[PDB]
Design an enzyme around this catalytic site. Sequence first.
Site, PDB file in Angstrom:
ATOM      1  N   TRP A 133       0.877  -1.161   0.000  1.00 29.12           N
ATOM      2  CA  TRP A 133       0.000   0.000   0.000  1.00 29.12           C
ATOM      3  C   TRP A 133       0.915   1.211   0.000  1.00 29.12           C
ATOM      4  O   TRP A 133       1.680   1.412   0.937  1.00 29.12           O
ATOM      5  CB  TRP A 133      -0.856  -0.019   1.253  1.00 29.12           C
ATOM      6  CG  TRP A 133      -1.940   0.993   1.300  1.00 29.12           C
ATOM      7  CD1 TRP A 133      -2.973   1.131   0.419  1.00 29.12           C
ATOM      8  CD2 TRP A 133      -2.133   1.991   2.309  1.00 29.12           C
ATOM      9  NE1 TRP A 133      -3.798   2.158   0.819  1.00 29.12           N
ATOM     10  CE2 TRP A 133      -3.303   2.704   1.975  1.00 29.12           C
ATOM     11  CE3 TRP A 133      -1.437   2.344   3.470  1.00 29.12           C
ATOM     12  CZ2 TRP A 133      -3.789   3.749   2.754  1.00 29.12           C
ATOM     13  CZ3 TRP A 133      -1.915   3.395   4.237  1.00 29.12           C
ATOM     14  CH2 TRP A 133      -3.075   4.087   3.875  1.00 29.12           C
ATOM     15  N   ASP A 214      -2.465  -3.593  10.155  1.00 29.46           N
ATOM     16  CA  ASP A 214      -3.245  -2.529   9.543  1.00 29.46           C
ATOM     17  C   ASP A 214      -4.603  -3.133   9.177  1.00 29.46           C
ATOM     18  O   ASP A 214      -4.676  -4.037   8.353  1.00 29.46           O
ATOM     19  CB  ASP A 214      -2.518  -2.014   8.294  1.00 29.46           C
ATOM     20  CG  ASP A 214      -3.246  -0.858   7.612  1.00 29.46           C
ATOM     21  OD1 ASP A 214      -4.441  -0.645   7.894  1.00 29.46           O
ATOM     22  OD2 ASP A 214      -2.626  -0.171   6.779  1.00 29.46           O
ATOM     23  N   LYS A 249     -14.084   3.014   5.897  1.00 33.17           N
ATOM     24  CA  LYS A 249     -14.751   2.195   4.890  1.00 33.17           C
ATOM     25  C   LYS A 249     -15.973   1.458   5.452  1.00 33.17           C
ATOM     26  O   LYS A 249     -17.054   1.511   4.864  1.00 33.17           O
ATOM     27  CB  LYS A 249     -13.742   1.231   4.254  1.00 33.17           C
ATOM     28  CG  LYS A 249     -12.693   1.932   3.361  1.00 33.17           C
ATOM     29  CD  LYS A 249     -11.257   1.824   3.921  1.00 33.17           C
ATOM     30  CE  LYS A 249     -10.234   2.584   3.049  1.00 33.17           C
ATOM     31  NZ  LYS A 249      -8.803   2.129   3.271  1.00 33.17           N
TER      32      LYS A 249
END
Lengths: 399, 399
Positions: A133, A214, A249
């Site tokens: 990422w 994460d 999200k």
Amino acid sequence: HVGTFENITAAPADPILGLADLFRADERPGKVDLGVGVYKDETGKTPVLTSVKKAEQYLLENETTKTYLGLDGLPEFGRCTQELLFGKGSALINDKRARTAQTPGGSGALRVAADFLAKNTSVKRVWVSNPSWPNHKAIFNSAGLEVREYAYYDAENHTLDFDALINSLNEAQAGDVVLFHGCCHNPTGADPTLEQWQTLAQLSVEKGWLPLIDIAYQGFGRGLEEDAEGLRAFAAMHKELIVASSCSKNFGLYNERVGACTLVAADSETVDRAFSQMKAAIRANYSNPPAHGASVVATILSNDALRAIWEQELTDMRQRIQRMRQLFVNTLQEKGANRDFSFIIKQNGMFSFSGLTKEQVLRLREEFGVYAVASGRVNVAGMTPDNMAPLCEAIVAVL
Amino acid sequence: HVGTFENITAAPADPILGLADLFRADERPGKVDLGVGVYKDETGKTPVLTSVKKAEQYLLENETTKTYLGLDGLPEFGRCTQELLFGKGSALINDKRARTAQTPGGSGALRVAADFLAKNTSVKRVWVSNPSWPNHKAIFNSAGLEVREYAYYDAENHTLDFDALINSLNEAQAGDVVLFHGCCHNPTGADPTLEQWQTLAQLSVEKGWLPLIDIAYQGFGRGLEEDAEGLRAFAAMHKELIVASSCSKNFGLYNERVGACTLVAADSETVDRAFSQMKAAIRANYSNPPAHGASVVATILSNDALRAIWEQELTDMRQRIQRMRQLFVNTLQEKGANRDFSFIIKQNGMFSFSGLTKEQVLRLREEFGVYAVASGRVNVAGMTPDNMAPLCEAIVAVL
């Protein structure tokens, strides 16, 4: 006196931003943007969840002050976060081995984690997956930590190459940090199985790595509890852990910046000392975290009926994503793709590597108005029953 | 393997927090907290402003998404901020010389500034007033910048010792940053006159300092436009400036974390280059700022009716503070204080140094339930018509 800013070199332009501009200006009615980085529903919107709207009305009606929260944010939000992550009734929570600071998003948690480590430990290196990422490297480098990549995704065969992963991690030294995505690996969608998580956890104890998890997609994979299994396997095995979690999200609260950095240590005293230093890292940064988003989350999770509405919303998103994954594979076949794309049904979350080359990606944009990012990453939430056929025809034409 | 956290030392105790603990366990009914760091109204509350409630209702009704904004946040909030700071018809704004990133509070702004300077400029030192806001040192130090102090307040005589100030700054080198509080100096309440601001701005140009204006109390001093005089005197004279601004206090939005970092350079192309690297500093930190608070502010400032409500609210806060300053001095006098406190009436904003010793401060707490911080800083917004007499009687008793 020459200007202090006079000789500054401009940062390179963000390619994704340039892509977004190009898309916006594209007047072809057939255009489709698979390069987007957020959830979208079947109509192509990223709406405010109804559970969130209800929570916001409640706060409008009942909030009597905006006075500063402590450095660690809203206590109830911290408790709700820990329960989500570890499960209510966790021995970890009972033993008071966890402390949580509400932060401005999972991104803020990662930075706080980085500053805390750089200033209070001997950690010099953080390991991330290949592909990574992109924002991880920037965040950790900024605190003076080197970032190295471990083997993870086999892009030719579309698998998590677990044997390559564990072998590559032999280079990780005791006291290094090794970062894993908790579920819905971004950008591949390839997650360790539970057995694999347990192997990684054991290996981490044997090698002496500090795991950093994460986790920004809890609930988008197989479900809230299932998506936490890997984190919990690490938590069962380790004296110490850092978790950077996000509600951007799963509550659709992206711009409200809602997340948390959780520390876990061997005992209550140790986590408490460590946490005092993490607070110092916060005080030197943005001082205290933004209340609105965390308040919304606490308000939803604390209330049986609201929580029920939200969990159905989350289930809805997950299942729409799974539906598009299946419809994508089936339509590629129907359109005569000269390749197998079954790996798509085996991956979790909104992102997968399509396996398209940058040249095919470019052709897809120019010739067909189908936008993906240079890496070939596609967001399946950018797909709908109505745009699937032409999108897949285009992809087949480019193979 | 041994743990990464085991050898971490506990951070030093936070005396403010410990004093807040003490205050809470204090069951006495006459308690008076002059140590608080926020505005309080005549009933001792820190309310949500009516203009804010109205703005939040409007957002509840109107918002259709919370998807990420850019690294610089909400464009309209940036423009409204620049207008407030530089005024309508600023040549500087007209020349496109300014860029503003919305940040999590003025604190976030100061940290973003620090990281940006450390990574992209040759700035080695930041100069701050003695005394200054307590968090400046930690913020700038975290980015690798040395913090030095310049002379400012004459505590015996209760004055801004301007000659000491300018002489101490001779030690600041070309390229150093010099930080000034825009108005309502925290914690002294002693501000430069306009003429002294003009003298400071001229010295700055001659010496080649990069001014950083930290402004968190615009409107609490004399009024919105008046409180910007100093910043604008610098703006008139400089090719380059940095401003860290906050809406925490003037909008009562403390916990929503709404502020901005504004860069000014010689011209548009130059500030673009600089701002692109500031965005990179944001990306490596918390990524993007929290929307709710900034949205509230833009909603208020962009609507004439709402803005008028907010301005009246801000005037009411400013005037309550000025009235408490006057009442405090008058009541001490008629309670027979053995000393003159007239300096209090002249000072700007909610903070002043009382001039009380730490012995007297201790005794005020132990014997009278009157709480201030060790330095004798008091927040006059903690005073009310109803608590003023008993408060002044206690103070007199310890003189």
